[PDB]
Amino acid sequence: IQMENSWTISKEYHIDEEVGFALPNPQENLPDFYNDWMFIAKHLPDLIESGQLRERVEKLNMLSIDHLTDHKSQRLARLVLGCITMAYVWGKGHGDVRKVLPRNIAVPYCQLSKKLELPPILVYADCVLANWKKKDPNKPLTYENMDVLFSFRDGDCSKGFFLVSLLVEIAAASAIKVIPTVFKAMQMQERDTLLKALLEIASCLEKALQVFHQIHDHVNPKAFFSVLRIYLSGWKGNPQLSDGLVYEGFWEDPKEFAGGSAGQSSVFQCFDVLLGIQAAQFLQDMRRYMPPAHRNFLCSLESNPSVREFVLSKGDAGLREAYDACVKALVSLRSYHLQIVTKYILIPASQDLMNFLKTVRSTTEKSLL
Ligand SMILES: CCOC(=O)C1=CC[C@](C(=O)OC)(c2cc3ccccc3n2C)N(S(=O)(=O)c2ccc(C)cc2)[C@@H]1C(=O)OC(C)(C)C
C-alpha cells in the first residue's frame, strides 16, 4: 500500500477520506455543449414510458467528448450515457430489445469508457458511486438529505436502491483509513494497536449491515424484480443478446459485458482480501468493472503480509476475538444478503446467484478462527 504520508494512503488510489470509494460531491451538470444528452437522461422515465426514448436517441447528433475536461465531468457523462444505453437496449423491458447501439452515442460512450478504463456498460461506480447529491450541503450524508441524479422508470425504486447501496458503501469504507494501522501494528508487533484496529473494522462492517436494513423502507420487491433489474441487466451470457451488443462505429463485432453484479463493490472485496477470506473467477473478473485506481488498491492490499497468518501465529485470545468479530460481521452481512435476494428476486421470480452467494457465505464462515 502506497502512502501519501505517515498517516494516509496515497491519493493515487482515489479513495476519499469521507466517502471512500464513492465519488466525492459528484458533478450534477455537464457543460452546455452536452445539453441534449442531459435532457434524455433526466427524462428517461417519461421517455421510456411514452415509447419516445429510442427515437430521441436516434436523432442525437454525435457530440465530441473533448469538452469533458476533468474526472468528475467524465464520470457524470459516463453515468448519463450508461443510463441512456440501458434504456435504449432494453426499452420498456418486455422483450423488444435493440442489438445495435447507434453510433451517435456508441462512439462517445466507448471513447469515454476507454479513457476511464471502464467497460462501455453501466457499472456500480456509475449508478451508485457517482449518482448522488446532497440536498443541503451543510447536513450529513443521510437518506433524508440525499437524492440520486438519474432513475430509469417512475416507481423503479432506483433512489432507494442506489442510495441505500451507497450509504452501505460509505459506512463500510470508514474502516479503510484504519488499514495502514493494521499493517504498521503487524510490522511493529503492536498487539493492542492491531486488536483495536480490527475492532474498529468490525464496528464499521456491523454499521454497514444496519444501514442495509433501510432497503425495505425504500425498495419494494416487485418493483425491483420486474423493473429496476431490467436496466441493471447486461449482455454477457444473456440469451436475449447472446453475442453481446454492437457498438456502432466503434467495433464491427458485438461485445459482451456483464451488468450490475455482486462483486463490483470495492470495499467488500477489500475486507475479504484484508482478512484472508479470498465463484473466485467471477469475483476476479468483476474487479475489471471497478475504477482502475480502486483495482490497484485491492492489488496492493493482496501484496501485504497476511493479517490472518499473523493472528494465527500469535496464539492470542484477544486478537482471535477481534479478527473473528470482523469475519462474523461479514457472515452476518452475507446471511442477510441471502435473505434479501430471496425476498427481492427469488420469491418475485416464483410469482444460480443464490448458490454463488451460499458459496461466498460458506467461505466466509470457514474463515472464523
Ligand atoms: C435487492 C438486490 O440487492 C443486491 O443484490 C445488492 C445490493 C447492494 C450491492 C452493494 O454494493 O452493497 C454494498 C450492489 C448494488 C448494485 C447496483 C449496481 C451494480 C452493482 C451493485 N451492487 C454490488 N450489492 S453487494 O455489494 O454485493 C451487498 C449486498 C448485501 C449486503 C448486506 C452487502 C453487500 C448487491 C448486488 O450485487 O446488486 C445486484 C446484483 C447488482 C442486484
Residue numbers in the entry: 3 to 280, 288 to 360, 383 to 400
From the manuscript:
Biological evaluation revealed that apoxidoles define a new potent type IV inhibitor chemotype of indoleamine 2,3‐dioxygenase 1 (IDO1), a heme‐containing enzyme considered a target for the treatment of neurodegeneration, autoimmunity and cancer. The three tryptophan‐catabolizing enzymes indoleamine 2,3‐dioxygenase 1 and 2 (IDO1 and IDO2) and tryptophan 2,3‐dioxygenase (TDO) catalyze the first and rate‐limiting step of the Kyn pathway. The IDO1 active site consists of four sub‐pockets A to D, of which pockets A, B and C are normally separated from pocket D by the cofactor heme. In contrast to inhibitor types I–III, type IV inhibitors do not coordinate to the heme in the IDO1 active site, but target IDO1 exclusively in its heme‐free form.
A co‐crystal structure of apoxidole‐1 with apo‐IDO1 was solved to determine the binding mode of the compound. The crystal structure revealed that apoxidole‐1 binds to pockets A and D, occupying the heme‐binding site spanning both pockets. Residues 360–383 belonging to the JK‐loop are not resolved in this structure, thus indicating a flexible structural element. Residue Phe270 adopts a conformation similar to structures of holo‐IDO1 without a proximal pocket D ligand. Consequently, pocket D is in an open conformation and allows for solvent exchange between helices E and F. Furthermore, Leu384 on the N‐terminal side of helix K points into the free heme‐binding pocket as typically observed for structures of apo‐IDO1. The ligand is framed by the hydrophobic amino acids Tyr126, Phe163, Phe214, Phe226, Leu234, Phe270, and Leu342 and is additionally stabilized by polar interactions between the carbonyl oxygen of the ethyl ester of apoxidole‐1 and His346 which is normally coordinated to the proximal site of heme in holo‐IDO1. Similar to other co‐crystal structures, we observed unexplained electron density in close proximity to the tosyl in pocket D. In contrast to the ligand core, the tosyl appendage of apoxidole‐1 is flexible. Hence, we modelled two different conformations of the ligand with the tosyl pointing in different directions (green and cyan sticks). Considering this and the large free space in pocket D, this part of the ligand structure could be further derivatized to achieve higher occupancies, possibly improving the affinity to IDO1. Apoxidole‐1 dose‐dependently reduced the Soret peak, proving that compound binding to IDO1 releases heme.
